[PDB]
A paper describes a structure:
The structure of P. aeruginosa WaaG (PaWaaG) in complex with the product analog UMP was solved in the space group P21 to 2.0 Å resolution. The PaWaaG-UMP structure shows clear density for UMP, which binds in a deep cleft between the N- and C-terminal domains. The UMP nucleotide is positioned by three residues from the N-terminal domain and seven residues from the C-terminal domain. Specifically, the uracil base is supported by hydrogen bonding with Arg173 and the backbone nitrogen of Arg261, in addition to hydrophobic interactions with Phe13, Ile234, and Ile264. The ribose moiety is positioned by hydrogen bonds involving Arg173, Arg18, and Glu289. Superposition of PaWaaG-UMP with EcWaaG-UDP-2F-glucose showed the nucleotide component of the ligands to occupy the same position within the active site. Amino acid residues that support the nucleotide though hydrogen bonding were shown to be entirely conserved, whereas there were some differences in a small hydrophobic area in the binding pocket in close proximity to the uracil base. Specifically, Ile202, Ile234, and Ile264 (PaWaaG numbering) are all valine amino acids in EcWaaG. Comparison of the structures (including PaWaaG-UMP) indicated no significant overall conformational changes, with low RMSD values ranging from 0.252 to 0.552 Å for all structural comparisons.
Numbering used by the authors: 1 to 109, 116 to 370
Write the structure that this text describes.
Amino acid sequence: ATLAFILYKYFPFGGLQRDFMRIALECQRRGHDIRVYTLIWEGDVPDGFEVLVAPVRSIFNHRRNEKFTAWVRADLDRRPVQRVIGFNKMPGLDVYYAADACFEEKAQTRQWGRYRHFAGYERAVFDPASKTEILMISEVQQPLFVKHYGTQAERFHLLPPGISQDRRAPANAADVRAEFRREFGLEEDDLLLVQIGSGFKTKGLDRSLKALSALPKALRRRTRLIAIGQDDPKPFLLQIAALGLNDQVQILKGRSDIPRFLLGADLLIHPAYNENTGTVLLEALVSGLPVLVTDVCGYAHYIAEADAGRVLPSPFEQDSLNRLLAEMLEDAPARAAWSRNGLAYADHADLYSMPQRAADLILG
Ligand SMILES: O=c1ccn([C@@H]2O[C@H](COP(=O)(O)O)[C@@H](O)[C@H]2O)c(=O)[nH]1
């Protein structure tokens, strides 16, 4: 009957959250009851989901997390379930969905309460004595986990991407784009950069703004950027002012009409410092939106392979981003080709079936 799903936070505008939601919904369609344990739930509660919001408190997140696992475990001890699936690393998981990269790997780039907590919770999952089954979405991170923990090969299962169908370009894409461009006041010659997804700092909004500001006068004048995410705009409001970008940048809060932004824009810019996968890279691809992304992103290879944009090699060089942005925007035939390529690729590649493959592994 019952499946316990565990994640620290539910909200609709996150990739971890949307993956969780598509997996929970697929399990519910196969006959199972759905219980969710969480620190917060924003937005509607689907019909039939029992959502338990933990009442635990602590000034430090890592300590909040520890009290959360105690609270959750008490409840399961009293009201058991058939399988426990986590979206965050912690003890007590039968299945862990690897929405984060390897923490130990990034920590080596230690007496802290934070570090100790996060490595201990990673180890609880990945230590060879753990029974946790792991659903991988970044192929590249599996050897990093093995390197740090010695995790058994037979415990890892790689899933395809899980892009939702509404991201796919519709038969009326031209009109959706036209209506979006009207609403935002973008002419045929205007160029729109979009930076999409919460966590602007890690996803490199500071680098995107610098590249926009560094453009040649002729392109700079025609170009604007919209960032969309739940983050506090205020640290970026200062950067935007200092680069003189007040009249050509907007930062919006989370929205549920992302496909309109992907159809209406001219380039997705994603110069992330680090990124486990990069859902929005693939969402741009299926919408025929050209991408500019750093090679550090786990899904950047899809952009190279589909020939749907340009991947910036490491090590990161602001000068190299600046030049590559200007070349992509100056090259209109190249953008048209990147666009066609992404749409052709989206029609034959499996970028969709994650939730069914995940549900198969969770359930048999
Ligand atoms: O305002 C927003 C920001 C992101 N998102 C979605 O959240 C996901 C972000 O992916 P990520 O967490 O893997 O970076 C992706 O599917 C976006 O389309 C929204 O739906 N609305």
